[PDB]
């Protein structure tokens, strides 16, 4: 690019996720993006991988890493969502080695 | 900015690089603990309550990079 | 990033860049979860399907860079 880039997006529902791909969606992943109707545009691309997925808490005002940019099918394509590593779900693991 | 060297690499024992990138996650234990500044600072990992409440349909996440 | 905007300085402080150092080539992204821990996509370090088996020796990281 030319400067760090930022893009905000909606966690999309299971069913709508599964429906957008041939590939097997697991418990460890989540899609996010605007449905083709929602008007708003944008997404992740290559070399974006690994990048963080963060959400700002209302409770405290600290950010949390919600997922990891895990995979796709192109970029900005109507009808396709972006797959994300479900951080909360591999946290026991993350625990284990850091504390190890 | 700051360049850093790696000491170790940890890959989810059950990554599925073979079927469908399931458990796509790796930890890189740095060599030398970095110093926080106004442009260097950790991020939070959630707890069962922040995930349950936040992880939701239409709830916006922010994404950043150089891709 | 497809159809985003340029961050503001300070905004994304956990923002870590996986690079190669041999010659230089940005590969992936990541985040600082600590002073001695980086969180990344497993498939950034190793995806055989595409010839990709980096080892510690293979990479360097750049903290706190925001173009």
């Amino acid at each position: 690019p030319s400067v760090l880039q930022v893009v905000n997006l909606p966690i999309v529902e299971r069913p709508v996720c599964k429906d957008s791909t041939r590939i097997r969606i697991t418990d460890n992943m989540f899609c996010a993006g605007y449905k083709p109707d929602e008007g708003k545009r944008g997404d992740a691309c290559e070399g974006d991988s690994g990048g963080p997925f963060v959400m700002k808490s209302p409770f405290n005002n600290r950010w949390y890493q919600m997922g990891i940019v895990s995979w796709g099918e192109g970029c900005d394509r109507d009808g396709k969502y972006g797959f994300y590593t479900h951080v909360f779900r591999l946290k026991k693991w993350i625990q284990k080695v850091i504390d190890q | 900015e700051k360049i850093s060297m790696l000491e170790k690499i940890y890959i989810h024992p059950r990554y599925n690089w073979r079927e469908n990138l399931d458990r796509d996650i790796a930890l890189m234990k740095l060599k030398k603990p970095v110093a926080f500044s106004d442009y260097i600072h950790p991020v939070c990992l959630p707890d069962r309550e922040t995930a349950a409440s936040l992880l939701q349909a239409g709830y916006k996440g922010r994404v950043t990079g150089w891709g | 990033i497809v159809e985003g905007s340029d961050a503001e300085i300070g905004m994304s402080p956990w923002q870590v860049m996986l690079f190669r150092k041999s010659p230089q080539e940005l590969l992936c992204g990541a985040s600082l979860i600590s002073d001695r821990w980086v969180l990344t996509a497993a498939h950034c370090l190793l995806y055989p399907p595409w010839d990709k088996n980096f080892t510690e020796n293979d990479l360097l990281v750049r903290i706190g860079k925001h173009s």
Binding site: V6, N8, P10, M55, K56, S57, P58, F59, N60, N61, R62, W63, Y64 | S37, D38, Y39, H41, P42, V43, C44, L45, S53, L54, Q56, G58, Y59, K60, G61, R62 | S5, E8, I9, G10, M11, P13
Partner: peptide, 28 residues
């Protein structure tokens, strides 16, 4: 323990240009 707070924003009691967008979208 000082995870997620950001020296150039949350510490200077400050806000970014699109962080209100994240917050409006939730329900706690």
């Amino acid at each position: 323990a000082d995870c997620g707070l950001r020296p150039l924003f949350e510490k200077k009691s400050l806000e970014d240009k699109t962080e209100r967008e994240l917050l409006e979208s939730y329900i706690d």
